[PDB]
């Protein structure tokens, strides 16, 4: 094939990018807040449909390395195409220059993939938007980036993407303070959980939280831990 | 824009005979075959006032003959056109009636 499927618009755009942005909104919702020493990406997980497994059904947040986690919102099918490249580039980094990836670098590469599919003949661009997070190796500053279909990436102190991202981000302007992150890791879990129960609702059976602490600690919380934070917050409120 | 209409207007002034100006959508008429009455009378008139020149402007309002499909057709256009041909035939005058026809299709 060789025909353009991305073409210039008489306005100033490409219609496939605006369209792709519309695609991220019709997806499920992932939230990002970083603490003083943690990233937390939590995601809304479906359960309209029932008899769905929990062990074998893939999660919304897929560990690339031992220190770089990626979450995605938009088409759940497409997602796996951006991640397959992203994992192999991380092993190539280890090979050719040594040291594992820096979060800034992986975000720039992932951006370059979506960038390319906005301008190469015979592709549409990805309808999928990432929160790519993690730690730099031998450092402990939390890093939280979000890249989007344009092929543009932005760093964010806290961010949210997917359905009702404007509604959630409004919440986060009013409770997360740029100057003083949540004082500990635990305060940071209560913030991501506090945000989700606005839009997601319908029990703690939908809320997923992955927490990363520096020095290669990836833990994904159990349904019991989630219930516990939702309950506290419901009651206090 | 190449002055086919110009050359006819000229021709009118030069021959000093009866010049019957005609516009092809004027001829089509919504009363059944009164469009045809218009063909025969205009040409009947041209026998009298002989020698003559009929100048027709357009010819895509006597359109074309290609319709045969069950759903509609327009056989109002065809009839007034087939009447035009019977006046050009041998039983009518044609040796004292010239027809000047001008079209851009």
């Amino acid at each position: 094939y060789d025909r353009a499927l991305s073409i210039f618009s008489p306005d100033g755009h490409i219609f496939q990018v605006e369209y792709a942005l519309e695609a991220v909104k019709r997806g499920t919702c992932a939230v990002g807040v970083k603490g003083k020493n943690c990233v937390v990406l939590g995601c809304e997980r479906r359960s309209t449909l029932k008899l769905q497994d929990t062990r074998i059904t893939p999660s919304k947040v897929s560990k690339i390395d031992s220190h770089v986690v990626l979450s995605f919102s938009g088409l759940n099918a497409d997602s796996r195409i951006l991640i397959e490249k992203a994992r192999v580039e991380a092993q190539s980094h280890r090979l050719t220059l040594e040291d594992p990836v820096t979060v800034e670098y992986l975000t720039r590469y992932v951006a370059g993939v979506q960038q390319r599919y906005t301008q190469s003949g015979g592709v549409r661009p990805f309808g999928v938007s990432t929160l790519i997070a993690g730690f730099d190796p031998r450092d402990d500053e939390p890093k939280l980036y979000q890249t989007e279909p344009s092929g543009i990436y932005s760093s964010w102190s806290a961010q949210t993407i997917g359905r009702n991202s404007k509604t959630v981000r409004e919440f986060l302007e009013k409770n997360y303070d740029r100057k003083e992150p949540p004082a500990t890791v635990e305060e940071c879990v209560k913030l991501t959980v506090r945000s989700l129960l606005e839009v997601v609702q319908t029990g703690a059976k939908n809320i997923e939280i992955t927490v990363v602490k520096p020095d290669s600690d990836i833990v994904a919380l159990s349904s019991e831990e989630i219930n516990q934070y939702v309950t506290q917050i419901e009651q206090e409120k | 824009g190449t002055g086919k209409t110009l050359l006819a207007r000229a021709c009118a002034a030069q021959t000093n005979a009866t010049f019957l100006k005609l516009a092809a959508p004027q001829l089509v008429q919504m009363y059944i075959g009164e469009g045809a009455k218009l063909v025969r009378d205009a040409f009947a008139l041209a026998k009298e006032k002989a020698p003559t020149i009929i100048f027709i402007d357009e010819l895509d309002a006597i359109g074309t003959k290609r319709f045969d499909s069950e759903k509609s057709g327009d056989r109002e256009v065809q009839r007034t056109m087939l009447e035009l041909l019977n006046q050009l035939d041998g039983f009518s005058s044609d040796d004292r009636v010239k027809v000047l026809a001008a079209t851009n299709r």
């Binding site: 094939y1 499927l5 519309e22 909104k25 449909l49 497409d78 195409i81 | -």
Partner: protein
């Protein structure tokens, strides 16, 4: 001009969305019903043929049950021609992972590979999708029996029980009211016949319109045995459950 006759199968709509993947799923709702239930001692796979005739050989047909490898068989619902290709790909890939690692391929690996293949066609090439829906029954040591559905979008989701094809809404609702966590293959055999009985468009459900296979760990020496039941045992087990 060539560009003049291009469909553009693979742009988005204004909704953010892929007309041709949506339509593909539309046509699989026409196709034959297939249901899979993962018991805790097997997986029962059962699918009802979309066509039937009495001159039609239906005794050695296996146009809905296809074995990918020794431990993973799938049920098919959609464009059978498109499926025959990817079944034969799958069979190449499953055998390949065994050749190079000398290890039984996990259910997860084969299912994800097939998904990404569908995924390549909605992503690029200017080609129509492969409209296939697979239900994968598979065994691995690691996670036991694993159950899975894949769509033409090239996305995979786990199940414990699921139904694709015609009458999806109807079948799905029925499974849920009955399904318990403590079920063995016997309860599963009964439910699979039974949901199919409620979605059926024949005046009574019969064996010649049923294809039926199981995978049991209750086969000897703690081994998984794939059994595609013959139509004469299906007719037998149909007398047991008292459907006919």
């Amino acid at each position: 001009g060539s560009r003049r006759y291009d469909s553009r199968t693979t742009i988005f709509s204004p909704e953010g969305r892929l007309y041709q993947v949506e339509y593909a799923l539309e046509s699989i709702s026409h196709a034959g019903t297939a249901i899979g239930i993962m018991a805790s001692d097997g997986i029962v796979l059962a699918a009802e043929r979309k066509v039937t005739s009495t001159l039609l050989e239906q005794d050695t047909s296996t146009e809905k049950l296809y074995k990918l490898n020794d431990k993973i068989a799938v049920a098919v619902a959609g464009l059978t021609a498109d499926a025959e290709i990817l079944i034969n790909t799958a069979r190449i890939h499953a055998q390949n992972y065994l050749k190079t690692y000398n290890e039984d391929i996990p259910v997860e690996i084969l299912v994800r590979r097939l998904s990404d293949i569908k995924q390549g066609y909605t992503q690029h090439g200017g080609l129509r999708p492969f409209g296939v829906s697979f239900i994968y029954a598979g065994y691995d040591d690691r996670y036991g029996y694993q159950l899975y559905t894949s769509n033409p979008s090239g996305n995979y989701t786990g199940w414990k029980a699921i139904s694709v094809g015609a009458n999806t809404s109807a079948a799905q609702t029925l499974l849920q009211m009955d399904y318990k966590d403590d079920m063995k293959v016997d309860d599963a055999i009964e439910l699979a016949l039974k949901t199919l009985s409620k979605t059926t468009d024949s005046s009574a459900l019969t064996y010649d319109r049923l294809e039926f296979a199981t995978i049991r760990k209750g086969a000897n020496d703690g081994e998984v045995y794939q059994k595609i039941f013959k139509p004469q045992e299906i007719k037998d087990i149909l007398v047991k459950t008292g459907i006919t």
